[PDB]
Design a protein around this ligand. Sequence first.
Ligand SMILES: CCOc1cc(OC)ccc1C1=N[C@@H](c2ccc(Br)cc2)[C@@H](c2ccc(Br)cc2)N1C(=O)N1CCN(CCO)CC1
Ligand SMILES: CCOc1cc(OC)ccc1C1=N[C@@H](c2ccc(Br)cc2)[C@@H](c2ccc(Br)cc2)N1C(=O)N1CCN(CCO)CC1
Ligand SMILES: CCOc1cc(OC)ccc1C1=N[C@@H](c2ccc(Br)cc2)[C@@H](c2ccc(Br)cc2)N1C(=O)N1CCN(CCO)CC1
Ligand SMILES: CCOc1cc(OC)ccc1C1=N[C@@H](c2ccc(Br)cc2)[C@@H](c2ccc(Br)cc2)N1C(=O)N1CCN(CCO)CC1
Ligand SMILES: CCOc1cc(OC)ccc1C1=N[C@@H](c2ccc(Br)cc2)[C@@H](c2ccc(Br)cc2)N1C(=O)N1CCN(CCO)CC1
Lengths: 85, 85, 85
Amino acid sequence: ETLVRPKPELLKLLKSVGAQKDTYTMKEVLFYLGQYIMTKRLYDEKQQHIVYCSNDLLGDLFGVPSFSVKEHRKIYTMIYRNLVV
Amino acid sequence: ETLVRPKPELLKLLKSVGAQKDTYTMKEVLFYLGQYIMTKRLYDEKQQHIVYCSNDLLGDLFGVPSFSVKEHRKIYTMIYRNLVV
Amino acid sequence: ETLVRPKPELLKLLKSVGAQKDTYTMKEVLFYLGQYIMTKRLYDEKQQHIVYCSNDLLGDLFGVPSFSVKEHRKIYTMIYRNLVV
Ligand SMILES: CCOc1cc(OC)ccc1C1=N[C@@H](c2ccc(Br)cc2)[C@@H](c2ccc(Br)cc2)N1C(=O)N1CCN(CCO)CC1
Ligand SMILES: CCOc1cc(OC)ccc1C1=N[C@@H](c2ccc(Br)cc2)[C@@H](c2ccc(Br)cc2)N1C(=O)N1CCN(CCO)CC1
Ligand SMILES: CCOc1cc(OC)ccc1C1=N[C@@H](c2ccc(Br)cc2)[C@@H](c2ccc(Br)cc2)N1C(=O)N1CCN(CCO)CC1
Ligand SMILES: CCOc1cc(OC)ccc1C1=N[C@@H](c2ccc(Br)cc2)[C@@H](c2ccc(Br)cc2)N1C(=O)N1CCN(CCO)CC1
Ligand SMILES: CCOc1cc(OC)ccc1C1=N[C@@H](c2ccc(Br)cc2)[C@@H](c2ccc(Br)cc2)N1C(=O)N1CCN(CCO)CC1
């Protein structure tokens, strides 16, 4: 049980999909992020592993137009930058 | 910020010297244990780096009668078992 | 409470971390030196117990490129060379 504290904007994001805490485990962070992408359909209708986030609050936070769910380190890094760490 | 959550006993120990939260960074955890040990003089006054936790809550929580503050890995481990981690 | 007087060099250093006295108590100093090192990020990233001070005033004061926080007398010996009396 290793918790993290998301910054104001990220916490706003997680909370838009049901999150209710201030600190979370990374597992929870990724879960909520996953749900958010799926819910707002930021993934490519054709190939679901490609995420197109430009034009969304998510794009702002990750600072990239798109990314692959395979790029784990890149993903951990983009989340990192959004952590009161 | 990387937070951990102390089990009830460790949490009493921590709060017995001033702690006021439920989750802490390991830096804050070790800071407090430091104070607890100093405030109760569990350290050997003839070798200040040796800690004798025998017959003390810290001893029941760490499962050792003594240890050196130089055994970092050992200390992180004894602390791990007292974490809802 | 045995107050101590840090030479000009070291005295100026402690100050940089928000210290306000010409004399302190070892417990106070070490706490600050620890703060200096940490936030200054002078420790090996995969072994926080290793301190790389070269390329820093601290290395000057101690006269060492690096050292381990486990080297206790050495850290005392080094601070005793930075103290009046
Ligand atoms: C948004 C679509 O994401 C996927 C697409 C895939 O296409 C084949 C396969 C796996 C995923 C997927 N992997 C998950 C994940 C978790 C942590 C890290 Br680090 C990386 C990836 C996790 C995820 C979490 C956060 C972020 Br950011 C990106 C991906 N995650 C998911 O969100 N999904 C939703 C889509 N489905 C399809 C179900 O058949 C699989 C799981
Ligand atoms: C999300 C996966 O994270 C891990 C996976 C690991 O697999 C080898 C090992 C360690 C971690 C881990 N390291 C933590 C961390 C904290 C600060 C910085 Br700077 C860097 C890393 C911290 C972390 C924090 C932010 C980010 Br981004 C990535 C990792 N963090 C975790 O969240 N962990 C470690 C503990 N475990 C379960 C152990 O019983 C869950 C995952
Ligand atoms: C209780 C005895 O404490 C010491 C005695 C020493 O003898 C020379 C040297 C260092 C310490 C000391 N080191 C600190 C520490 C922090 C993290 C890890 Br992991 C290990 C050690 C930290 C500590 C924290 C938690 C735990 Br468990 C053990 C040690 N801690 C302290 O509590 N200190 C700092 C050093 N001095 C200054 C006055 O003599 C005594 C108090
Ligand atoms: C005390 C320092 O610990 C680290 C030092 C590192 O060196 C770079 C890297 C990662 C960590 C680190 N790993 C985390 C962790 C959590 C669960 C498990 Br199971 C294993 C490891 C978790 C941890 C939890 C409990 C215990 Br016991 C030991 C480590 N955790 C941390 O405590 N931290 C705090 C310090 N930061 C960087 C601060 O600038 C990194 C993460
Ligand atoms: C800056 C990192 O320092 C450490 C790294 C360690 O790595 C495992 C373990 C213990 C310490 C540590 N020991 C403390 C200390 C106090 C008096 C003397 Br004599 C020697 C050491 C004291 C210190 C004081 C002055 C100087 Br010089 C060097 C170290 N002190 C600290 O500064 N810290 C701060 C960081 N934390 C992380 C815990 O998760 C541990 C304790």
